[PDB]
Amino acid sequence: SFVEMVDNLRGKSGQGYYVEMTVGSPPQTLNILVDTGSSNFAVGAAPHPFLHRYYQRQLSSTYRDLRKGVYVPYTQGKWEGELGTDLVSIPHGPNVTVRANIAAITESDKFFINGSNWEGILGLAYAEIARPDDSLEPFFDSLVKQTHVPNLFSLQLCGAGASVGGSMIIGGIDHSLYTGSLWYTPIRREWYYEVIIVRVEINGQDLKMDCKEYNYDKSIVDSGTTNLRLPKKVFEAAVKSIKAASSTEKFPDGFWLGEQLVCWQAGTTPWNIFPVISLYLMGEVTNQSFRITILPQQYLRPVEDDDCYKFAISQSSTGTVMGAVIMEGFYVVFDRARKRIGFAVSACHVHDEFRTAAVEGPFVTLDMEDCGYN
Ligand SMILES: CC(C)(C)c1cccc(C2(NC[C@@H](O)[C@H](Cc3cc(F)cc(F)c3)NC(=O)CC[C@@H](O)C(=O)O)CCCCC2)c1
């Protein structure tokens, strides 16, 4: 649903996943980062040391200026630019063309990456967190309003199998991309893709915190953030257990902070000493939830030059962010029509000789609604 969009994403480890788009008439081709954690469509529109190409408004007979500026601040990077509209399409995407809002980026700081291969960002979340304000229609809303594409997309983000790939199925769910059942969690509110974590286990041991801690101040699925990011108190409980699981090894302190590799001899990575992490999500029926299980092969992410890794779980003071390492090896369905996100085991699942990533349920969990913050 459909073959045409299967394997339509590419990326580098830790630099997001991008999809090919064209903007303007005639079509100008850009690579565009696929970001469930923001809601603005923006594209390099002026030279910058890190851009191979950029969008050229003067060459599009279909460009229209909105004569209004815009800027967006992310966790660290930020850009400013000029709002306009234009015709936009996705070559490996549905067969449609829309007029969508476009921020043309004229200045930026710490936003583009050195050898990135991407030139723009596709914020796929709801108008609410759009900049300057919720009146700037996000691209996906426009796509839905203009064409007949169903109000639904799914993301199959894959780890290696040194440089990566994946699929963005616009408008449905492609059955060849996952196994087992889909389990759905409610979208709590339509701004970020907000969800609610009702329970946390590490190698089968409940973390025993008040479930409010898991969602303080929000939990969101964010394909535009690399790490699993955890609220301070949860982060420290989790590192504690992960340290004691793996104490048979000697770890620098900068490792646990994400600012320093650990290396082992090719093929000898001590997989079995790192615990599995289970996240239980609110389910669709009363008192029911389901779990997703993350393997060490998701949260110790590989970087080149021996097999080398960074700890891809880190600290947040803006809530739980289920980033790209959590999403890898799941097929994640953003079912906007039904205010829900589905998780299944990805067809490109992460393997381990003795353990496997899993979406399992049903589980009973009382008082799930008390887990939400405010
Ligand atoms: C855009 C908006 C809505 C105002 C905003 C602001 C701050 C944080 C976010 C959130 N989404 C954040 C998400 O949009 C952005 C997209 C992005 C990807 C990129 F490659 C470079 C960037 F400059 C920006 N990603 C990041 O800021 C993290 C990037 C990097 O540190 C990494 O972890 O890989 C993250 C925290 C929880 C809320 C959602 C969103």
Tab-separated table of C-alpha atoms in Angstrom, residues 115-368:
chain	number	residue	atom	x	y	z
A	115	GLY	CA	27.855	15.890	4.794
A	116	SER	CA	24.204	15.419	5.217
A	117	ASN	CA	22.612	14.803	1.894
A	118	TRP	CA	19.471	16.544	3.044
A	119	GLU	CA	18.426	20.131	2.368
A	120	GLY	CA	15.061	20.618	4.131
A	121	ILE	CA	12.694	19.322	6.837
A	122	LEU	CA	9.175	17.922	6.611
A	123	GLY	CA	7.456	18.503	9.965
A	124	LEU	CA	4.677	15.955	10.053
A	125	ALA	CA	3.022	16.842	13.340
A	126	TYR	CA	-0.140	18.993	13.944
A	127	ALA	CA	-0.757	22.693	13.280
A	128	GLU	CA	-0.726	23.453	16.967
A	129	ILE	CA	3.045	23.530	17.279
A	130	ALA	CA	3.594	25.116	13.896
A	131	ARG	CA	5.551	28.388	13.717
A	132	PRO	CA	4.596	31.240	13.670
A	133	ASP	CA	1.149	29.940	14.740
A	134	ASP	CA	-1.445	27.200	14.125
A	135	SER	CA	-2.767	29.010	11.072
A	136	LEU	CA	0.170	27.915	8.990
A	137	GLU	CA	-1.230	24.656	7.559
A	138	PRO	CA	1.256	21.828	7.816
A	139	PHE	CA	2.112	19.975	4.623
A	140	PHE	CA	0.331	16.750	5.579
A	141	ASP	CA	-2.892	18.602	6.347
A	142	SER	CA	-2.662	20.267	2.925
A	143	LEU	CA	-2.008	16.914	1.260
A	144	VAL	CA	-5.068	15.502	2.902
A	145	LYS	CA	-7.334	18.448	2.068
A	146	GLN	CA	-6.264	18.706	-1.569
A	147	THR	CA	-6.039	15.075	-2.752
A	148	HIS	CA	-7.791	11.856	-1.793
A	149	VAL	CA	-4.850	10.386	0.194
A	150	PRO	CA	-6.224	8.885	3.441
A	151	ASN	CA	-5.305	10.772	6.656
A	152	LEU	CA	-2.632	8.235	7.756
A	153	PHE	CA	1.068	7.629	7.237
A	154	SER	CA	3.511	4.996	8.506
A	155	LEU	CA	7.248	4.923	9.033
A	156	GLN	CA	9.539	1.900	8.905
A	157	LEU	CA	12.901	3.209	9.984
A	158	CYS	CA	15.729	0.691	9.615
A	159	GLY	CA	19.147	0.434	11.254
A	160	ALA	CA	22.121	-0.868	9.103
A	161	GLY	CA	21.317	-3.692	6.573
A	162	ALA	CA	27.819	2.387	7.637
A	163	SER	CA	24.554	4.168	6.156
A	164	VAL	CA	20.668	3.467	6.355
A	165	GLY	CA	17.191	3.180	4.873
A	166	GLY	CA	13.492	2.864	5.443
A	167	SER	CA	10.012	3.516	4.077
A	168	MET	CA	7.438	6.327	4.528
A	169	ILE	CA	4.075	4.990	3.370
A	170	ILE	CA	1.953	7.969	2.796
A	171	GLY	CA	-1.824	7.337	2.948
A	172	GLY	CA	-1.986	3.748	4.353
A	173	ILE	CA	-0.194	0.731	5.796
A	174	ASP	CA	1.798	-1.678	3.654
A	175	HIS	CA	1.455	-5.202	4.925
A	176	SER	CA	4.803	-6.417	3.671
A	177	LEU	CA	6.661	-4.177	6.107
A	178	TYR	CA	5.858	-5.829	9.437
A	179	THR	CA	4.935	-9.101	11.109
A	180	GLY	CA	2.526	-10.021	13.879
A	181	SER	CA	-0.192	-7.634	15.055
A	182	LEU	CA	-0.354	-3.933	15.287
A	183	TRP	CA	-1.021	-2.618	18.727
A	184	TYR	CA	-2.351	0.950	18.995
A	185	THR	CA	-1.944	3.566	21.649
A	186	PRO	CA	-4.144	6.706	21.795
A	187	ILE	CA	-2.857	10.008	20.547
A	188	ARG	CA	-3.498	11.986	23.697
A	189	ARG	CA	-3.732	15.341	22.065
A	190	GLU	CA	-3.032	16.433	18.537
A	191	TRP	CA	0.016	18.712	18.716
A	192	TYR	CA	3.167	16.552	18.962
A	193	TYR	CA	2.353	12.870	18.434
A	194	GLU	CA	1.583	12.639	22.153
A	195	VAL	CA	1.218	9.232	23.846
A	196	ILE	CA	1.165	7.859	27.437
A	197	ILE	CA	3.630	5.374	28.939
A	198	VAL	CA	1.991	3.456	31.757
A	199	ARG	CA	4.799	1.189	32.872
A	200	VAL	CA	8.598	0.756	32.553
A	201	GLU	CA	10.549	-2.535	32.938
A	202	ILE	CA	14.281	-3.270	32.526
A	203	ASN	CA	15.140	-6.908	32.065
A	204	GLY	CA	11.703	-7.685	33.621
A	205	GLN	CA	12.168	-5.476	36.689
A	206	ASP	CA	9.589	-2.731	37.119
A	207	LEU	CA	11.286	0.633	37.607
A	208	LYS	CA	8.701	1.263	40.338
A	209	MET	CA	8.263	5.069	39.748
A	210	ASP	CA	4.877	6.839	39.724
A	211	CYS	CA	3.838	6.543	36.047
A	212	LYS	CA	3.466	10.376	35.975
A	213	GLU	CA	7.275	10.491	35.958
A	214	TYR	CA	7.319	8.610	32.636
A	215	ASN	CA	5.221	11.402	31.036
A	216	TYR	CA	6.584	14.537	32.653
A	217	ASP	CA	5.809	16.738	31.029
A	218	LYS	CA	4.828	14.809	27.860
A	219	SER	CA	5.734	11.625	26.035
A	220	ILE	CA	5.900	11.850	22.214
A	221	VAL	CA	6.973	9.725	19.293
A	222	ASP	CA	9.704	11.859	17.503
A	223	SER	CA	11.327	10.526	14.308
A	224	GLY	CA	13.409	13.690	14.189
A	225	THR	CA	15.279	13.014	17.465
A	226	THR	CA	17.891	10.240	17.459
A	227	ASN	CA	17.898	9.083	21.121
A	228	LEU	CA	15.370	7.768	23.510
A	229	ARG	CA	15.198	10.739	25.853
A	230	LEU	CA	13.972	10.328	29.350
A	231	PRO	CA	12.898	12.779	32.096
A	232	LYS	CA	15.800	13.305	34.610
A	233	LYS	CA	14.426	11.049	37.432
A	234	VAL	CA	13.477	8.240	34.985
A	235	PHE	CA	16.794	8.679	33.193
A	236	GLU	CA	18.678	8.134	36.441
A	237	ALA	CA	16.632	5.097	37.444
A	238	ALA	CA	17.264	3.612	34.010
A	239	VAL	CA	21.019	4.254	33.944
A	240	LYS	CA	21.297	2.814	37.485
A	241	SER	CA	19.776	-0.507	36.300
A	242	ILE	CA	21.554	-0.522	33.037
A	243	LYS	CA	24.892	0.007	34.946
A	244	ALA	CA	24.220	-2.839	37.363
A	245	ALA	CA	23.061	-5.182	34.500
A	246	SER	CA	26.405	-4.574	32.774
A	247	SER	CA	28.838	-4.072	35.730
A	248	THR	CA	31.146	-6.868	34.451
A	249	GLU	CA	32.533	-4.150	32.209
A	250	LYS	CA	34.445	-0.923	32.814
A	251	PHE	CA	32.684	2.156	31.457
A	252	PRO	CA	34.006	5.726	31.269
A	253	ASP	CA	31.592	8.275	32.803
A	254	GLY	CA	31.366	10.143	29.483
A	255	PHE	CA	29.844	7.011	27.956
A	256	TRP	CA	26.676	7.251	30.042
A	257	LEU	CA	26.343	10.907	29.058
A	258	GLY	CA	26.354	10.136	25.327
A	259	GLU	CA	29.639	12.073	24.775
A	260	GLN	CA	32.098	9.118	24.222
A	261	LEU	CA	32.319	5.786	22.379
A	262	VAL	CA	32.970	2.354	23.788
A	263	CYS	CA	34.636	-0.100	21.493
A	264	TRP	CA	34.984	-3.856	21.227
A	265	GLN	CA	36.767	-6.063	18.760
A	266	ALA	CA	34.666	-6.672	15.593
A	267	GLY	CA	32.052	-9.418	16.183
A	268	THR	CA	32.667	-9.572	20.042
A	269	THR	CA	30.205	-6.930	21.336
A	270	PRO	CA	28.889	-8.159	24.732
A	271	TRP	CA	25.212	-7.991	23.701
A	272	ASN	CA	23.924	-10.292	26.456
A	273	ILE	CA	25.023	-8.050	29.359
A	274	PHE	CA	22.899	-5.148	28.300
A	275	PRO	CA	19.310	-5.441	29.501
A	276	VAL	CA	16.127	-5.158	27.384
A	277	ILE	CA	13.876	-2.170	28.029
A	278	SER	CA	10.088	-2.585	28.045
A	279	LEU	CA	7.797	0.394	27.497
A	280	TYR	CA	4.145	-0.186	28.214
A	281	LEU	CA	1.783	2.174	26.310
A	282	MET	CA	-1.864	2.888	26.985
A	283	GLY	CA	-3.990	0.664	24.816
A	284	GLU	CA	-7.358	0.964	23.116
A	285	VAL	CA	-9.654	-0.809	25.681
A	286	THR	CA	-10.233	-0.093	29.324
A	287	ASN	CA	-7.422	-1.175	31.731
A	288	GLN	CA	-5.378	-2.568	28.812
A	289	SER	CA	-1.968	-1.726	27.581
A	290	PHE	CA	0.730	-3.418	25.508
A	291	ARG	CA	4.507	-3.393	25.562
A	292	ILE	CA	7.303	-2.585	23.244
A	293	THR	CA	10.675	-4.193	23.940
A	294	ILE	CA	13.908	-2.440	22.932
A	295	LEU	CA	17.114	-4.391	22.572
A	296	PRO	CA	20.669	-3.106	23.324
A	297	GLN	CA	21.133	-3.193	19.539
A	298	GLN	CA	18.795	-0.193	19.405
A	299	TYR	CA	20.081	1.962	22.234
A	300	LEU	CA	23.829	1.413	21.697
A	301	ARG	CA	24.133	2.990	18.269
A	302	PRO	CA	27.033	2.236	15.957
A	303	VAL	CA	29.527	4.821	14.630
A	304	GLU	CA	32.500	3.890	12.278
A	305	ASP	CA	36.304	3.467	13.057
A	306	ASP	CA	36.588	-2.449	15.994
A	307	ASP	CA	32.808	-2.167	16.483
A	308	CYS	CA	32.125	1.162	18.190
A	309	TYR	CA	28.974	2.599	19.923
A	310	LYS	CA	27.388	5.622	21.539
A	311	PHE	CA	24.779	5.282	24.373
A	312	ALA	CA	21.623	6.533	22.646
A	313	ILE	CA	19.534	7.122	25.813
A	314	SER	CA	19.870	10.549	27.306
A	315	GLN	CA	18.394	13.149	29.546
A	316	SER	CA	15.443	15.383	28.868
A	317	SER	CA	13.722	18.231	30.628
A	318	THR	CA	11.002	18.330	28.045
A	319	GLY	CA	9.412	14.853	28.561
A	320	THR	CA	9.961	11.374	27.044
A	321	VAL	CA	11.024	11.476	23.445
A	322	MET	CA	10.742	8.142	21.668
A	323	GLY	CA	13.285	8.988	18.984
A	324	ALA	CA	14.685	7.172	15.981
A	325	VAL	CA	16.386	4.488	17.969
A	326	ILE	CA	13.119	3.399	19.495
A	327	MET	CA	11.348	3.506	16.153
A	328	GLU	CA	13.985	1.408	14.327
A	329	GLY	CA	12.829	-2.178	13.908
A	330	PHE	CA	9.181	-1.227	14.592
A	331	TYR	CA	6.662	-0.315	11.873
A	332	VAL	CA	4.993	2.755	13.373
A	333	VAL	CA	1.530	3.824	12.112
A	334	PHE	CA	0.491	7.425	12.616
A	335	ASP	CA	-3.267	6.804	12.222
A	336	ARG	CA	-4.436	10.436	12.409
A	337	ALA	CA	-7.924	9.498	11.274
A	338	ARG	CA	-8.419	7.359	14.362
A	339	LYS	CA	-6.275	9.479	16.801
A	340	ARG	CA	-3.899	6.561	17.350
A	341	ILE	CA	-0.345	5.256	16.813
A	342	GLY	CA	0.205	1.543	15.918
A	343	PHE	CA	3.414	-0.420	16.620
A	344	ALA	CA	4.323	-3.710	14.994
A	345	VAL	CA	7.587	-5.649	14.693
A	346	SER	CA	9.347	-4.258	11.614
A	347	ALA	CA	10.188	-6.572	8.694
A	348	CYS	CA	13.701	-5.049	9.128
A	349	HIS	CA	13.721	-6.038	12.838
A	350	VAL	CA	16.840	-5.968	14.958
A	351	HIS	CA	18.195	-9.524	15.684
A	352	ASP	CA	20.156	-10.878	18.585
A	353	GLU	CA	21.067	-14.519	18.860
A	354	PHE	CA	18.845	-15.188	21.917
A	355	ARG	CA	16.461	-12.207	22.257
A	356	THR	CA	13.948	-10.385	20.112
A	357	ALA	CA	12.227	-7.013	19.927
A	358	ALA	CA	8.486	-7.365	20.396
A	359	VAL	CA	5.165	-5.669	20.519
A	360	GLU	CA	3.161	-7.818	22.977
A	361	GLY	CA	-0.206	-7.653	24.623
A	362	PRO	CA	-2.769	-7.431	26.139
A	363	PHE	CA	-1.649	-6.468	29.610
A	364	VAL	CA	-3.893	-5.232	32.392
A	365	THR	CA	-2.899	-1.952	33.940
A	366	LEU	CA	-5.036	-0.081	36.352
A	367	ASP	CA	-5.452	3.646	36.540
A	368	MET	CA	-3.773	4.406	33.262
